[PDB]
């Protein structure tokens, strides 16, 4: 948890609009900027939050913001510039906005700001939001190459910003088909040299709830084995959807519904047959944003999420004018809101008709519950990891290209104060010890884990993270090292400009 | 949790016979009696588990055997008598098993045998079970003085041995009544100096969820201003428990079913204005045999309770022929058993019907919620307070005379490793730090609290715990103190003979 609160404010200028740079700035180190420390930490978020008068309302309306990091022989640099999207190049052309965000209309067509995340697809990296639209850019000079509409590919709708990625560089997602959700595949780039994306296919479908309203997915958990989806009671109300939407006036906030009576609905598909596995798993309502593991012990699932207790959509709580409210009205905004939990389920996969009414889950270190009822559903209880109050545990990150997938120890997260990201936290699954870095008037982004390159241990690395500190007696923001065996200060690069919320991202080694 | 496996099988020596004495035992001490401590450690129990060659099936059939250690200017004694209800005194008239038991059916008429737990009632003591039958004992020589019926005085076929005692005398208790749940107040000893049994009276009533299938209710919680009851999905078939009996051959354990899909309804009453309150709280499915304490924080009840996860009958894996089984097949045998967890839930008091779809747990303390929904539901979820992994955190008592009822921070419990009792532990329910005692091939019973008589804090005093150590090198059984603080030893009186389980009691002051 947090032991810090925020009457000054300055989590606002998480939400303040900044320049893009012409060319890279140096950051000021203090401390030591590791050696082995050789490429770039690449993330998104938005960085324009109006069209001149016409604001935007929303966090996830903001103008796509494509950020640097580079690191060298201990000297680091920062870079920026925004993606030039239709949504931005057209407002820009047309001083004004264009097209309809997340949660902000319009006035007199599906947005591409990919503000969300970026990743690799064989060569090329692609920045992302949730839309048919993905965006290849320069990672080098963060220049933008091309507009890439999955639609021409594969038959989705949209695909979440995070595709799972094996090591050989096979790229997985999921998405909503117009009714299924579809798992598609993107194979790694091969002899012949042509674009992965004309390789594309689906190669498993997930059944949906209700026939005229899909949920909203946001990620989805992977196994060498095996495919894992949540299907949360927030659903797409798609009558809202697909009716004409500059005549009422609609967002895509305005298209979100709950479903009471569901609860959450668990899903596996077998990843090498190509099959959707048909067990029933049910369990209580519950928001889903980010898995952080899944793997397989004897034959049961381990999914660990970041859970929000409720089926009101936690997207509700996310707008600009609440975040940029005063302390004491942001912490009451938030009391209503669902409560975040870190939570294991365990799903087995060898379901006997002879043990109807009993506990499944034979693990010997979990306290985990799967029930199977006569209806031949199977009731899960989770066992939590993390609970504190208002204080969500968030955007995870683990030792992912040794681990995911993979029996593992360590999460790291972003530490939620009444929805003010205001720490870093680690946490170890196994036994429930947490760690915490945490600095007053410091607003930090998700950390991103970095082995080092003769490390034995999970946890033998550092996490990078993206610090705002407003405030004086500070310089504006810093790029923060941590030590990820005890989240210690290893350094801080220090720039000297503002720096804006950030979502998602990644290192490139070099 | 435990730390400890328990290949030996010393556990059996909790279900194995014992005689009674006929006068009290020295129990010779190391360490040292704190001086403040005189009175009485009381405790029931089954001591007698054969008549003859007749034997007894479940633990909760053994004959009754009161307990008791006395204290005075640091030196301690030990004694017990069987008490002589209906069931043991025909049965060693008639040298056979007479009274069908809990899990036992008599070949060829309700049980008295009050092997659970011990009360006051004006001046008087009662021995209990759950029935109707309550007995009369003297704390002093451990003789039985009288059998009492409750149905003489007031509408119920049974009652918990677990009721609420309030500071001035005055007794509440929860019962069925063949179809609703009523609470009986038995009011102090008045200045006439008759017997308050006699003015016994139900309050208030509670409603069924099934009007031929009552929910098997082991205790209930209580504030100043509130009762709240919790009804489970483990159910009595009324269709099989009033249908001729010794035609087949049923005894209670067979009258017990496991309803599916109803989850677990809670359930308040206004204590001062008797009565009950219309509020549709629900959750998922638990077995609960002990709530913790309950409490008011504005307008929220806190409700603590001891949980198993799943809605099979926790009582199915308390046969004796189990639980004296070699400890690998204990293990074994609990795999598939409801998962033990402590749990915080919050009860809203004020239901506004424009925060539907809302969370109502605007409390700043706790991630446990309440969501109000279209239908007036309230769907609850938890805060885990404590969860090990088939280690049951049980039998809790807190500093009941003093802080029952009211905001608390400590309890103390029985750990029960795949159901052995093998630790000590102690909980702190703000913070959910714990502290545990244990010994190799050492088998304790449920901690009871005794405050320094004038501590004016929560855990100024000690725990007193009755131990079974079989296995030489040791004497058979000792009485523990524990500093409430730490739970570091601070005393044992040591007794020559074997003690079996033991299930609850009372430290009686003098
Ligand atoms: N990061 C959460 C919001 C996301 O950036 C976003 C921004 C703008 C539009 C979106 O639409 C999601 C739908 C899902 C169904 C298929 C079409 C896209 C989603
Ligand atoms: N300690 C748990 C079991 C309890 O000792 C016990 C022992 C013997 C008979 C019982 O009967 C419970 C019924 C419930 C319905 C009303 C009558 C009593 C219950
Ligand atoms: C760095 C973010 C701080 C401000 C917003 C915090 C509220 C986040 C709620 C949980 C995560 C929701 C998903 C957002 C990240 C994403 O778009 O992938
Ligand atoms: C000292 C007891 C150890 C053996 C029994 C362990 C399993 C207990 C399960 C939860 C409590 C059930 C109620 C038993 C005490 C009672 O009858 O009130
Ligand atoms: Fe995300
Ligand atoms: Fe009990």
Redesign the interface.
Same mark, same amino acid.
């Given at each position: 948890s947090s032991q810090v609160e925020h009457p000054a404010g300055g989590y606002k200028k998480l939400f303040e609009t900044v320049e893009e740079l012409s060319s890279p700035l140096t950051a000021h180190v203090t401390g030591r900027i590791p050696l082995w420390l050789t490429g770039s930490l690449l993330r998104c978020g938005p960085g324009l939050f109006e069209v001149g008068s016409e604001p935007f309302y929303h966090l996830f309306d903001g103008q796509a913001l494509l950020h640097k990091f580079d690191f060298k022989e201990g000297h680091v640099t920062y870079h920026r510039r925004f993606i030039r999207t239709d949504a931005y190049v057209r407002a820009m052309t047309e001083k004004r906005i264009v097209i309809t965000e997340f949660g902000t209309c319009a006035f007199p067509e599906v947005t591409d700001n990919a503000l969300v995340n970026i990743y690799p697809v064989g060569e090329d990296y692609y920045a992302c939001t949730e839309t048919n639209f993905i965006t290849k850019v320069n990672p080098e000079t963060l220049e933008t190459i091309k507009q890439v509409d999955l639609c021409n590919y594969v038959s989705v709708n949209g695909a979440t910003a995070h595709p799972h990625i094996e090591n050989d560089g096979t790229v997985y997602n999921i998405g909503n088909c117009f009714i299924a959700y579809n798992i598609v595949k993107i194979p790694p780039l091969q002899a012949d040299k042509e674009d992965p994306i004309s390789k594309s296919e689906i190669v498993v479908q997930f059944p949906c709830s209700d026939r005229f309203k899909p949920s909203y997915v946001h990620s989805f958990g992977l196994t060498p084995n095996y495919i894992v989806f949540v299907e949360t009671p927030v659903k797409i109300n798609l009558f809202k959807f697909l009716s004409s939407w500059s005549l009422w006036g609609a967002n895509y906030m305005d298209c979100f519904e709950?479903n009471?009576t569901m609860g959450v609905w668990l899903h596996i598909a077998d990843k090498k047959r190509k099959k959707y596995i048909n067990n029933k798993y049910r369990?209580?309502?519950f928001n889903l944003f980010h898995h952080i593991n899944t793997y397989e012990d004897h034959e049961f699932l381990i999914v660990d999420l970041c859970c929000w /207790?409720?089926? +009101?959509f936690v997207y509700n709580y996310l707008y600009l004018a609440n975040l940029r409210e005063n302390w004491e009205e942001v912490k009451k905004n938030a009391? /209503?809101?669902?409560?975040?939990?870190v939570r294991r389920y365990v799903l087995p996969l060898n379901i006997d008709k002879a043990?109807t009414? /009993?506990?499944?889950?034979?693990l010997?270190?979990?306290?985990?519950?799967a029930?199977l009822?006569?209806?031949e559903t199977i009731?899960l209880?989770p +066992?939590?990891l993390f609970?504190?109050?208002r204080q969500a545990f968030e955007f995870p990150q683990i030792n992912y290209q040794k681990y995911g997938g993979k029996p593992y120890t360590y999460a790291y997260g972003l530490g939620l104060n009444h929805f003010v990201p205001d720490r870093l936290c680690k946490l170890n699954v196994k036994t429930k010890e947490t760690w915490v870095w945490q600095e007053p008037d410091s607003y930090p982004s998700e950390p991103i884990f970095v082995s080092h390159p003769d490390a034995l241990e999970e946890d033998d690395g550092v996490v990078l993270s993206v610090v705002v500190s407003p405030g004086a007696g500070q310089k504006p923001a810093y790029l923060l090292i941590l030590n990820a065996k005890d989240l210690s200060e290893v350094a801080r690069a220090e720039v000297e400009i503002n720096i804006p919320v950030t979502f998602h991202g990644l290192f490139k080694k070099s």
């Open positions: 709950s009471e369990t209580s309502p /207790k409720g089926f +009101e009391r /209503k809101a669902p409560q975040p939990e043990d009414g /009993k506990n499944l889950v034979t010997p270190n979990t306290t985990a519950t029930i009822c006569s209806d009731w209880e +066992e939590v609970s504190g109050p």
